[PDB]
Amino acid sequence: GFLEDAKTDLVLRNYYFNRDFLVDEWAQGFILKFSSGYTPGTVGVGLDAIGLFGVKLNSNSELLPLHDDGRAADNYGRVGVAAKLRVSASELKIGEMLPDIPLLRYDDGRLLPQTFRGFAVVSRELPGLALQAGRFDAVSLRNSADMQDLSAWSAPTQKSDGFNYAGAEYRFNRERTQLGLWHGQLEDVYRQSYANLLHKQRVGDWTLGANLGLFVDRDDGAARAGEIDSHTVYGLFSAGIGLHTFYLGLQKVGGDSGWQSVYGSSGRSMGNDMFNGNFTNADERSWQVRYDYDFVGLGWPGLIGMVRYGHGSNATTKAGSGGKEWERDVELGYTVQSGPLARLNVRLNHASNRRSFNSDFDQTRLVVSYPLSW
Ligand SMILES: COc1cc(C(=O)[O-])ccc1O
Numbered sequence: 241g242f243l244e245d246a247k248t249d250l251v252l253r254n255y256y257f258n259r260d261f262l263v264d265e266w267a268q269g270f271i272l273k274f275s276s277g278y279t280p281g282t283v284g285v286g287l288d289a290i291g292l293f294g295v296k297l298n299s300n301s302e303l304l305p306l307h308d309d310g311r312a313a314d315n316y317g318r319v320g321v322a323a324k325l326r327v328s329a330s331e332l333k334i335g336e337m338l339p340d341i342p343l344l345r346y347d348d349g350r351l352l353p354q355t356f357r358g359f360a361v362v363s364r365e366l367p368g369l370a371l372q373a374g375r376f377d378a379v380s381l382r383n384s385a386d387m388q389d390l391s392a393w394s395a396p397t398q399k400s401d402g403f404n405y406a407g408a409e410y411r412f413n414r415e416r417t418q419l420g421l422w423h424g425q426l427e428d429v430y431r432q433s434y435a436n437l438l439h440k441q442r443v444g445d446w447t448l449g450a451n452l453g454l455f456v457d458r459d460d461g462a463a464r465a466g467e468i469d470s471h472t473v474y475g476l477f478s479a480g481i482g483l484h485t486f487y488l489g490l491q492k493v494g495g496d497s498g499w500q501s502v503y504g505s506s507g508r509s510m511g512n513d514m515f516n517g518n519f520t521n522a523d524e525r526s527w528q529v530r531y532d533y534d535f536v537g538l539g540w541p542g543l544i545g546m547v548r549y550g551h552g553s554n555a556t557t558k559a560g561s562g563g564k565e566w567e568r569d570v571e572l573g574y575t576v577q578s579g580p581l582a583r584l585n586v587r588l589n590h591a592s593n594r595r596s597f598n599s600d601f602d603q604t605r606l607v608v609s610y611p612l613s614w
């Protein structure tokens with residue numbers, strides 16, 4: 241039922257951000273999600289809403305929008321609604337939403353999430369197979385209260401009438417393997433095709449995983465961001481045992497151009513994605529090593545750590561070719577497991593970025609999040 245199965249989730253997010261090239265930002269966010277149930281019947285009808293509000297505290301960062309003078313706003317926010325309609329094992333949503341698909345990953349790396357306006361269909365009528373398609377015609381950046389036309393990261397000022405997509409994922413092999421094929425079009429800017437293989441296999445105490453991906457990009461229509469021809473391949477491999485996980489990522493961009501994506505979106509579909517980049521400059525070859533540990537092994541349940549290092553070379557940028565870069569990320573995340581503060585999450589992380597072709601910097605973040613649900 242519409243009211244029966246309705247859930248309300250509120251996240252309080254206190255976010256401290258520092259980048260030393262020392263510049264600083266501190267802010268408080270509120271993210272309110274109201275998700276109804278569905279009316280009973282052949283066509284079920286529902287409504288989702290999202291409320292976003294951020295407040296500047298005394299002190300990228302992209303935590304808050306900037307005034308024209310370059311001064312961060314005191315506060316910002318917006319409210320979005322989406323209607324939902326369900327039939328059998330298929331759903332259509334229309335309005336404002338948070339798309340999380342391989343060709344369009346909504347960003348939530350700062351204070352409030354990026355949202356999009358459009359429609360999205362997910363259909364699971366045949367066992368193991370999920371079909372998706374949709375179109376988004378406006379976007380609100382993570383650091384903006386407003387909606388604007390979409391554009392590509394490679395030319396953020398060149399606007400498009402919208403982003404269309406369709407894709408399929410098939411999961412099989414006792415749920416261990418998944419294949420994905422996706423096609424997207426940012427109208428008059430670029431078209432992108434993507435294939436993905438996910439696989440996991442247990443060898444004794446080890447869990448071995450692979451995430452292989454291939455993107456192929458070209459300009460579309462009027463080609464407002466210029467001519468584009470790119471392909472990007474990555475393989476991200478994991479080996480887990482007990483409380484430990486090890487990763488090796490390998491990636492290469494080829495062709496005339498870098499890898500394409502929608503401006504403001506997250507780079508997290510890419511194998512070597514890290515906090516401050518994903519090594520997708522034209523021609524760039526990169527590798528990554530990563531280690532994760534679950535500190536329950538030291539009597540600290542709820543504490544998890546990650547360290548990762550990535551290096552890229554052969555990078556072509558406007559300035560020149562043969563560019564090199566590296567990033568090192570470290571994170572400790574703690575989630576309170578029990579007591580009055582249960583579910584409270586504290587994440588502390590640090591990134592160091594060095595680039596032969598751009599500015600070097602270190603970055604420190606502390607994010608304290610508390611979820612309430614009723
Ligand atoms: C628009 O409101 C919502 C959107 C979403 C989303 O798209 O995932 C989730 C919960 C919401 O309350």
Ligand SMILES: COc1cc(C(=O)[O-])ccc1O
Binds near residue numbers: 595
């Ligand atoms: C000269 O600047 C850099 C060089 C390298 C390298 O040689 O691996 C890496 C990152 C850099 O920022």
